[PDB]
Structure 1
Amino acid sequence: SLFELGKMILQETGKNPAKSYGAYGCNCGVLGRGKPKDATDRCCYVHKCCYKKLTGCNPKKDRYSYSWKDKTIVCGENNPCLKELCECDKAVAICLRENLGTYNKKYRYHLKPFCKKADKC
């Protein structure tokens, strides 16, 4: 759920997730997708497309277990849907950290309604 997602982002990046990524660009955080602005935003585009394959579970509210083991995110067993959910979230947290070099503060609080429409996943 959002609680696990946010924790993973903090562990990987060292940054407060709500603040750095809760409204970044056209795809990170609240709302749906749009044309990416940069590589951090493209990480969040892939992540939202990752959620589209999740069958019956709720990406926003279902909790799942994972542990931070030798500084790596390891998705616990859980059920089929929660496992894929955890795997979506781990991959966006790693991608956000990988692209910290190009993170741009000007997109931090982006006006999402003016984004160009996104391509189909």
Structure 2
Amino acid sequence: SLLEFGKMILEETGRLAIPSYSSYGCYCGWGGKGTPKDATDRCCFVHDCCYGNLPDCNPKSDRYKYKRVNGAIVCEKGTSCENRICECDKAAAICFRQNLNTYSKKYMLYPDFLCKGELKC
């Protein structure tokens, strides 16, 4: 669930999921339209494409457990859903960290009319 996803985000990046990654670019948030604008925006694009392969589960709320092993995120075992949802989240949070370098405030509260292509997954 987003309660776990938000925890990984704050752990890996130090920024809170809400402002920092809830209104960033064309895909970090809920609107989802156009072409990713940067490294961080693509992490977000890939992430909900990941939630896309999980029709039989509900990512927003089923909670899973994870823990670190030698500092790395590891998804504890559980139901197939809990595990796949967690992998989607794990990767995304790591992706936000590897790109903390190009994270710019110019992409926050980005306007809808600047989100461009037709892109599906």
- Fold in common (TM above 0.5): yes
**Which residue is 2:81 aligned to?**
81
CA contact (8 A) 1:33 1:48 kept: no
Alignment of 1:1-121 (within 5 A): 1-112=1-112, 114-121=114-121
- What is the CA-CA distance between 1:55 and the residue it aligns to? 3.0
Range with bigger deviation, 34-43 or 111-120 = 111-120
Q: What TM-score, normalized to structure 2?
A: 0.90
Point out 4+ residue stretches in structure 1 off by more than 6 angstroms. none
Shift of 1:33: 4.1
**Larger helix proportion of the pair:** 1
CA contact (8 A) 2:33 2:116 kept: no
Could you say what the CA RMSD is over the residues aligned between the two structures, in angstroms? 1.6
Q: Calculate the TM-score normalised by the size of structure 1.
A: 0.90
Cα offset for 1:118?
A: 4.0
* Structure 1, unpaired ranges of 5+: none
* Percent pairwise identity: 56
Go from structure 1 to structure 2 and tell me whether the alpha carbon gap of 1:79 and 1:108 turns closer, same or farther (over 3 Å shift). same
Give the match's secondary structure for 1:24.
Answer: coil
Deviation, 1:30, is: 2.1
5+ residue gaps in structure 2? none
Question: CA shift at 1:29, angstroms?
Answer: 2.0
